[PDB]
From Swiss-Prot:
Substrate-specific adapter of a BCR (BTB-CUL3-RBX1) E3 ubiquitin ligase complex that regulates the response to oxidative stress by targeting NFE2L2/NRF2 for ubiquitination. KEAP1 acts as a key sensor of oxidative and electrophilic stress: in normal conditions, the BCR(KEAP1) complex mediates ubiquitination and degradation of NFE2L2/NRF2, a transcription factor regulating expression of many cytoprotective genes. The chain holds residues 327 to 614 of 624 of the full protein. One of its GO terms (cellular component) is Cul3-RING ubiquitin ligase complex. The modification S-cGMP-cysteine is found at C108. Changing F152A: Abolishes repression of NFE2L2/NRF2-dependent gene expression. The gene is KEAP1. Keywords: Cytoplasm, Host-virus interaction, Kelch repeat, Nucleus, Repeat, S-nitrosylation, Ubl conjugation, Ubl conjugation pathway. Belongs to the KEAP1 family. This is Kelch-like ECH-associated protein 1. It is found in: Cytoplasm; Nucleus. Broadly expressed, with highest levels in skeletal muscle.
Amino acid sequence: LIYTAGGYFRQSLSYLEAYNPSDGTWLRLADLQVPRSGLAGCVVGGLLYAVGGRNNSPDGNTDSSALDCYNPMTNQWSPCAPMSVPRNRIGVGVIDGHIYAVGGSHGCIHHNSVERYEPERDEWHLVAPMLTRRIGVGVAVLNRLLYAVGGFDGTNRLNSAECYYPERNEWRMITAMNTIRSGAGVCVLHNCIYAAGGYDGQDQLNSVERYDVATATWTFVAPMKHRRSALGITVHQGRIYVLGGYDGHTFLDSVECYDPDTDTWSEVTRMTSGRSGVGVAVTMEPSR
């Protein structure tokens, strides 16, 4: 199933819901312990992690350093050790069973720092910081290298991208995207990095471009039906899914699906309520 955690609909949401692309159903699961938007989701060892974010609430607002883990076999959340700093609008990626937390904001601080979680020790450790401060950064892993794509440095939105080598502990700039994007959905499909949608400081975007490492080139592909920033994104059975987001007017419930064999997007479902800033990942369905 496609799990979506948290999000924003005028307050940090707690929803954890899972979409069955076969059934069409949305399954409503255990709430996050704390409402959070701007978080990321990922899966390690079959467990779903919710990382960072911010609790926007009618009584206060606080960025989050939390890491929490959801087990589909118990339908229970458990806390993990937190990150060194709160990271709203974070990006994450998984290499070798470790979670890399990238960028994000804490109040006025626009992070370039990066840190790594080891589930088997429940420990975070800082690694080399990015060349660039990036809030709303998109993150993907391809051939065990970590890519940070786009974002917002506090002043400018970014089309730059850079690549982290885990065993050299160093970041190297790569070719920039065609389009400036913060809050894009970035994922890896087949053998390439996709960056979908986002915000360039003027418009929400529906364009989608993909990076080929062999040619070190970004190429524009089939754009989405709906412009959207702060969308969620994941890959399920060889297809990209994009969830919700904000189009400048509305918090969308639209979910679109990219078929790479035909280069086409189609709308496949609606979330139960519109929201932006979700964490999304794919794992084995929960135990009836």
